[PDB]
Every structure is written in C-alpha cells, then in structure tokens.
Design a binder for this molecule. Structure first.
Ligand SMILES: C[C@H](NC(=O)c1cn(C)c2ccc(-c3ccn4nc(NC(=O)C5CC5)nc4c3)cc12)c1cccc(F)c1
Ligand SMILES: C[C@H](NC(=O)c1cn(C)c2ccc(-c3ccn4nc(NC(=O)C5CC5)nc4c3)cc12)c1cccc(F)c1
Lengths: 261, 250
C-alpha cells in the first residue's frame, strides 16, 4: 500500500503516471517540516481508506509518507465530476440519471455501513467513468480525522445540513450526509447549482437555517413526482425526520426498476 | 473589450491591487483567479458596455493562463462611508449632489437591464472632486466572474434566496444609503434583526443628528416601503429630486 515519490515519472490534484501500474491521481497533502509523530496514525487511516472496497467508492491505490511530504494516490475517473457531466452539451437521459442516483445511494449506504460519515457530499465529490457509472470521492479530505488534521496544519455550503451552518462544533452524523444527498438530487435534475439568486453568504446561511431550500420550480426538465418528495424528505429541517440510506435504497430501487430503467 | 497584459503595468500594491499602467495611469486590478473562456470573455464584453459618468468603467481584462483579472478605473477617495466618516465635513450641497449622482447612475443601469442587487456605501466610490461612481465589488451581477452586510437588502430577499431581484430591490437599497448619508454611519448599530426588518423595522430616523431636509426623510421612507410595489423607480425619483436639488440644495 505504501509507495515512493520515485515510483512515478517526473512532471494540488494532478495526473500521475506510476512506472508499472500506469495513470493515477495524486493529491499531495503536506510539503512542510518533518512531523513524524503523526505517521502511524496517518498510515492507519490510509489503511482504513484502502479497506473501503466497493464499486461506488474511489479506491485508494497508495500512500506516500516521506519525511517532508505526504501524498494520497487514487484511481482516475475519466469524465470528471457529476456537475461537469450534467452541464456537458450532450443531454443525460432520465434512465442514466436514475441509475446515478441509485449508485450514489449504494455507495453512501456502503460507507455508512462501515462507520464512515462522509461530511462533505456534493456533486464535486461524485466522479464519473466513461460508461457514466459513478464513484464517491473525498477531494477535501473531510472524512478521515488525521488526514484532515494534516491538511490543515501549518468549501461550498450549498449542500451542508442547516444544523452545521454557523456551527463549528456540531458533530456530523449519517443524517448530515442524507441532507447533502437531497440537494445533490435537486442538482441532478436542475443541471446546475442551487441558490443562483443569493446575493450574500450571510443571507444564504440565515435563509437556509430558517427553512429555505432549492427552488423545486427551477427544474424545468421532467422530474418524477416521487423524486421531488424524496428530496423534500431528505432535506427536512429536523435530522431525525430524515431517512437513512438503506431506507432510501428500499424505496428507490423498485421505483428505479419499474419506472426509470 | 481591451485585453491587457500584466507586462503593461509598472508597479503593483495590494489595497484588489492598485496598479500603474505604462501609459494610462493608475488603475484598480482585481485578480479573481479553459472550459470558461468564451463565456468569461462575453461577460467582460458586456461589463465594458456600461459607459456612464456615474458608473465605474471596465478598462480592460487580463486573460493569462494562471491569471484572470479585471482592470477598473481608480477612484481617489475610496468609498462613500470612508468619506462620510472623515473629519473634513461634507456640506448639505455636496451630499445632495452625491444623492443625485447615485440616482443618475442607478437610472442608467436599470435602462441597460442591469439590476445591481448589492447597492450599498461600499459600492459607491468617490473621486478627488467628490463625484461618485457606482461599482460592483462583489461581482454581484455577472454570474461566471462571481463564480470564479444585509443592512441594505430589501426585506423580500431576506430569508428568501430564490426570489428574483427587481429594480425595486435597488430602490430599497437606495433608501438605506440615504439614511447612511445623513447619519454618517452604518445603520442598526442577525436572525432577530432579520425578522424585525421583515416585519417593518427600519433605520432609526431620530439617530440622524445632522440637518436633514424634510423631502429627503420622506423619500427615504417612500423608498423603503415593505411592499416593493409602493416604491418609486429611479426615473421617478429623479423627476422629484433633480428640481429639489437645484432650487434648495445646490
Ligand atoms: C478513499 C477515498 N478517497 C478519495 O476518494 C480521495 C481523497 N482525496 C484527497 C482525493 C483527491 C482526489 C480524488 C480524485 C480521484 C480521482 N479522480 N479522477 C478525476 N478525474 C478528472 O479530473 C477527469 C479529467 C476530468 N478526478 C479525481 C479526483 C480523490 C480523492 C474516499 C475516502 C473517504 C470517503 C470516500 F467516499 C472516498
Ligand atoms: C463595470 C463595473 N465593475 C465594477 O465596478 C467592479 C467590479 N469589480 C470586481 C470591481 C472591483 C473593484 C472595483 C474598484 C474600482 C475602483 N476603485 N477605486 C478604489 N479606491 C480605493 O480603494 C481607496 C482610495 C484608495 N477602489 C476601487 C475598487 C470595482 C469593481 C460595474 C459592474 C456592474 C455594476 C456596476 F455598477 C459597475
């Protein structure tokens, strides 16, 4: 699982070419003074990332732990993130959008089943391959404590549950990821980011905390009536009222097979 | 649009940077930052069409491969709040002219189908002669370049980010600028205040200790009416305020 920087041809998210295994994605996280006290915990977190093995989760291919330099190596996803694909000038049919929603659900159920709270689910953390299959990613390292710590030693809020806005000590839960899935759902059918009419961040933060949600009327594409009810269910103000991902998969999978696929 | 190069500038200093152009003088540069380019250039081509004596002009754009910058004309005295708080006094006649120039600038923008949406004293810049220009520091009007305070927000946009701003949203902002011009300070010296504003709270008129003509108090109250329908338009304000300024204030 551990690699060396010299395992890569010579040229912060970059395309990298490993000398034997080929094209990969490299994110160098820290390039400063030595800090080897963190190293066993960083290595154990990398091993936890590497044990996340599921078709809808980006695989960690390697970790570089060098005396001044820490890097994570991931597999490459050819088509970029969900928002870029939704905005490409070829249209994405309802059947493919339905499949993507189910795969996001499958990936998120798997992560929650492994005791992982994503904490930063958004269209940019949903990557797409050539066949329009998706994998969940963590570009800002929001999910693993020590790597997030190392990233910050010396982000968009459209998808943040309202309980976390203006609250640095609220602990993210499974219901915080369910909130983010709701707005991603809205984005998949609007083909754009929400809240285009916001003027100021404090206006948007306070509006969302008081009950503002993405404009369902701004979906001019056909959006099945059950998916509008799903997003509204998932962005409920009270987290206890939000469903779980296994619960979402149990209602959305038959609906996807009978109507959308 | 004029496209410019970073090699066209001698000196830079942060302040958004003040830059010294090789021929055209002092300028303000905001470095903001290939999928983006024809639309990014088209927004700039559109900004450049705002040509008016009371609106800050886009002089050029720098599209370099690690660098995206907007170049604006420089306003020597900074923004309106900085000028109102200086201990050199601003007589009523200069305050009246400033109000009329804000109106001219706002009428011109609306005439071009531009809704400012963020009118406030920080977006009102002042030159050496105390003439003003309307600016958009937060890039609030052009989406993609913005892609790269609530005291002046009309109550219909408070706790409602999906309502579409109108010309009447700028008239509300004008009203609070009026109050600030005569108090020489920001008003309301958030969820509690937001709700009070949504139910009718306004800046305290009794907190204006400077002399303030009766017509400007009534205009202020007219322009900040809860119902957007009751607020005048800027051409409507100009027909009442231009003769009033000439006969009483100038
Ligand atoms: C183990 C996994 N950790 C990660 O996923 C990542 C963590 N960090 C810091 C990353 C940084 C970049 C990428 C990434 C990976 C692949 N690609 N592929 C393209 N493709 C194009 O840009 C195309 C040209 C247009 N971009 C990317 C970007 C991933 C991760 C994970 C952990 C926890 C929860 C999870 F859910 C998942
Ligand atoms: C075309 C025009 N676009 C803009 O207005 C600006 C857009 N962006 C991003 C800007 C960033 C900075 C400035 C700016 C310009 C000049 N000055 N001058 C001083 N002076 C002093 O700082 C102190 C005394 C020393 N500051 C400044 C700051 C302007 C703009 C516009 C568009 C739409 C509606 C409008 F109404 C106007």
């Amino acid at each position: 699982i551990k690699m060396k920087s010299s395992d890569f041809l010579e040229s912060k998210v970059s395309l990298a070419f490993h000398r034997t295994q080929g094209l990969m994605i490299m994110k160098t996280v820290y390039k400063g003074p030595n800090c080897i006290e963190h190293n066993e915990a960083l290595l154990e977190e990398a091993k936890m990332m590497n044990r996340l093995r599921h078709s809808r989760v980006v695989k960690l291919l390697g970790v570089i732990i060098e005396e001044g330099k820490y890097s994570l190596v991931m597999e490459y996803m050819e088509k970029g993130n969900l928002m870029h694909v939704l905005k490409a000038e070829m249209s994405t049919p309802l059947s493919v959008k339905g499949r993507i929603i189910l795969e996001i659900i499958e990936g998120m159920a798997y992560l929650h089943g492994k005791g992982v709270i994503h904490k930063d689910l958004k269209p940019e953390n949903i990557l797409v391959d050539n066949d329009f299959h998706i994998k969940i990613a963590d570009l800002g390292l929001a999910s693993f404590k020590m790597w997030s710590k190392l990233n910050n030693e010396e982000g968009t809020l459209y998808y943040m549950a309202p309980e976390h806005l203006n609250d640095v000590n609220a602990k993210p839960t499974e219901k915080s990821d369910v909130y983010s899935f709701a707005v991603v759902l809205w984005a998949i059918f609007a083909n754009k980011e929400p809240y285009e009419n916001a003027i100021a961040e404090q206006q948007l933060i306070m509006a969302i905390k008081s009950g503002n949600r993405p404009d369902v009327d701004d979906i001019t594409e056909y959006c099945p009536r059950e998916i509008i009810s799903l997003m509204k269910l998932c962005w409920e103000a009270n987290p206890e009222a939000r469903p779980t991902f296994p619960g979402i998969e149990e209602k959305f999978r038959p609906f996807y097979l009978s109507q959308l696929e």
